[PDB]
Design a protein around this ligand. Structure first.
Ligand SMILES: C[S@@+](CC[C@H](N)C(=O)[O-])C[C@H]1O[C@@H](n2cnc3c(N)ncnc32)[C@H](O)[C@@H]1O
Ligand SMILES: C[S@@+](CC[C@H](N)C(=O)[O-])C[C@H]1O[C@@H](n2cnc3c(N)ncnc32)[C@H](O)[C@@H]1O
Ligand SMILES: O=C(O)C(=O)Cc1ccccc1
Ligand SMILES: O=C(O)C(=O)Cc1ccccc1
Ligand SMILES: O=C(O)[C@H](O)Cc1ccccc1
Ligand SMILES: O=C(O)[C@H](O)Cc1ccccc1
Ligand SMILES: [Ca+2]
Ligand SMILES: [Ca+2]
Ligand SMILES: [Ca+2]
Ligand SMILES: [Ca+2]
Ligand SMILES: [Ca+2]
Ligand SMILES: [Ca+2]
Ligand SMILES: [Ca+2]
Ligand SMILES: [Ca+2]
Ligand SMILES: [Ca+2]
Ligand SMILES: [Ca+2]
Ligand SMILES: [Ca+2]
Ligand SMILES: [Ca+2]
Ligand SMILES: [Ca+2]
Ligand SMILES: [Fe+3]
Ligand SMILES: [Fe+3]
Lengths: 332, 334
């Protein structure tokens, strides 16, 4: 029906603005106001946070357009999809604020002749901000379970792809007096993690170093590697692949962290067989995005292959069904 | 519970709709849409090879489109979906939203705070905007624009286009009037570059030229000698940039003075709507209003345009309604 088609396509258009707005409204404080008080006064909010009021009105109207919010007067009210969208807001942020420039440039990123050198760009600072909540909301119950089952109190912990630095911080809050080292390949991750450990008071327990975990022998921070007895790596396992490169890299890690006992690896994985009209949140963005970036994404079943060959024993495996098909491995 | 399941689907639809939206503009640009339109279907691998594209990304693009109904995948093949004809109709609007204006909306957290609203506080892609607007013009404004051209009362010899963009409006004028000289003014280098490329390639290199400038201070624009020859003036999709009202009045006068031999001035634009319920917003409107509000650019209503012309030194002779794109309009001025 021509009218159903028109309403659908309009909804597709507006969903773009709503999607971009969710992450923005989180970052700026609006989603938190609404969860707390069920409602807010748009002018008041705009003045409180010193925001351009007409743009604010738009942001909320974009949210309203798809049911996240409902406007009555100068009041914004929690809408029927508020609780779902708010729960998942870090995913929208990662898609838009974080990875938005990648998808924007689709027509320049697909042609083979452009897929050379640095042919896409994302905002590493924003990815770090999103992934900090993605960790908490989706990965944490399995991560802490694995931490509870270590068998030992760790001393020096190393985190590959540290991002916001928040994992290392939370580990230090639990094990007071541990030392932390974060390796991330991106200047914006490093910078955010440094400001964050500084603000939060751990500046002499936790350091960071810019570096590539795939070329771990070339990372500049020699000193502390051999003292590390806990290794963590979250949301970047797939950067180790294809299969050969992953095996060789896993072996380099076992060699450069001789005294690591447990290695906790958490990641999302390429799904199989999900019908197109039923893709849950995140899945399509994760898979399409990485395919655009020329970054290999293994199935869960591919991972099983590689641990023993890379010189590691897989002791425990946790399913995370809350975020596409995700997993935590406890390796030894 | 129920309901929790409905909210879950609706939010997932919003997430994937972002990907579909961005893919609509892209599949347009790379020719997947034209090909699906012609043949009703295509082979994804064959399409990747013909156009030398990274095949895994190509699968994502069609999968993104398929996630919301625009297309369906059958095996290794792609087939027209139920929302195909409509998304294809409005594809230039998505291109405008994504490929053109996407940086604006991406940076909403850094664009809204007043403390940052200084200097170059947002970025868009002027080339891409030109590309999309070329089709927006043909798809939504042409009927009314050629009605106006037909009813000029004379045959133009020199046309100036303000906010020239792709340069395609000047090209089409020249097709219709083999005599005419054309001059386009745009404030953006990406528009100029695009339009110089287009006109050379289409063979109109010696008839049409372009100059970088700000139509708001038209009076201070370099190629002034050529302006006095002009007998048709056009302006499409940037008239709001002349606002607020006070500014629009002064600019209207500078144009009158900068173009003394202009007989007609055709002015086309989209305007700010009022009272559309949030869940009943059609395509484009929200994007147009929210984006200009983020950019800090005034958007007059239709009535607001009516006041201003006489005060700006012009008289409105004919007015066309365009309900195919938000609320849009073409004015014939004199
Ligand atoms: C999505 S994030 C997750 C951040 C963090 N681990 C967390 O749980 O919040 C993945 C991070 O890994 C980093 N990264 C990606 N490839 C890498 C590599 N080869 N070496 C080091 N870091 C990498 C990225 O810069 C990004 O900060
Ligand atoms: C939306 S586009 C339309 C392009 C073209 N007129 C068409 O109809 O396809 C608007 C154009 O206005 C130009 N523009 C905006 N403000 C301007 C100004 N103050 N002076 C000159 N050009 C301007 C932009 O560079 C852009 O190319
Ligand atoms: O940004 C990336 O490149 C990621 O891989 C991000 C990610 C991966 C898995 C879960 C959530 C985010
Ligand atoms: O890109 C802009 O700033 C525009 O004003 C675009 C536009 C305006 C009116 C109709 C179509 C596009
Ligand atoms: O092979 C697997 O499925 C996991 O990679 C790790 C594991 C293996 C055996 C028993 C438990 C966990
Ligand atoms: O004032 C108006 O309504 C239009 O701006 C132009 C117009 C005026 C009178 C008759 C026709 C057209
Ligand atoms: Ca209130
Ligand atoms: Ca509603
Ligand atoms: Ca582009
Ligand atoms: Ca970026
Ligand atoms: Ca290095
Ligand atoms: Ca190495
Ligand atoms: Ca779902
Ligand atoms: Ca379908
Ligand atoms: Ca941002
Ligand atoms: Ca900027
Ligand atoms: Ca841009
Ligand atoms: Ca100028
Ligand atoms: Ca509609
Ligand atoms: Fe990744
Ligand atoms: Fe505009």
């Amino acid at each position: 029906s021509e009218a159903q088609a028109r309403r659908a396509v309009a909804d597709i258009f507006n969903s773009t603005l709503a999607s971009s707005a969710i992450g923005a409204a989180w970052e700026l404080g609006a989603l938190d106001e609404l969860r707390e008080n069920g409602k807010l006064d748009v002018s008041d909010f705009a003045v409180r946070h010193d925001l351009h009021e007409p743009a604010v009105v738009g942001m909320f109207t974009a949210l309203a357009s798809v049911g996240i919010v409902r406007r009555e007067g100068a009041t914004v009210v929690v809408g029927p999809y508020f609780d779902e969208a708010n729960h998942h807001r870090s995913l929208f942020h990662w898609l838009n604020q974080g990875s938005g420039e990648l998808f924007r440039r689709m027509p320049q990123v697909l042609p083979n002749e452009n897929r050379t050198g640095k042919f896409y760009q994302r905002d590493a600072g924003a990815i770090s901000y999103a992934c900090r909540e993605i960790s908490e909301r989706y990965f944490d119950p399995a991560f802490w379970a694995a931490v509870d089952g270590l068998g030992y109190t760790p001393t020096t912990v190393a985190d590959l792809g540290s991002g916001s630095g928040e994992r290392l911080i939370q580990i230090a809050r639990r094990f007071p007096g541990v030392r932390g080292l974060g390796v991330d390949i991106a200047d914006g991750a490093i910078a955010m993690a440094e400001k964050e450990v500084a603000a939060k008071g751990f500046g002499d327990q936790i350091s960071f170093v810019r570096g590539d975990a795939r070329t771990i022998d070339q990372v500049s921070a020699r000193g502390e590697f051999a003292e590390v007895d806990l290794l963590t790596c979250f949301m970047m396992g797939h950067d180790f692949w294809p299969r050969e490169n992953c095996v060789q890299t896993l072996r380099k890690l076992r060699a450069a962290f001789p005294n690591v006992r447990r290695f906790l690896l958490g990641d999302a994985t390429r799904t199989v067989g999900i019908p197109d009209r039923e893709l849950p949140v995140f899945t399509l963005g994760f898979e399409f995005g990485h395919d655009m970036m020329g970054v290999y994404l293994p199935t869960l079943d591919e991972w099983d292959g590689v641990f023993e060959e890379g010189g590691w024993r897989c002791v425990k495996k946790h399913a995370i069904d809350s975020l596409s098909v995700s997993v935590v491995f406890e390796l030894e």
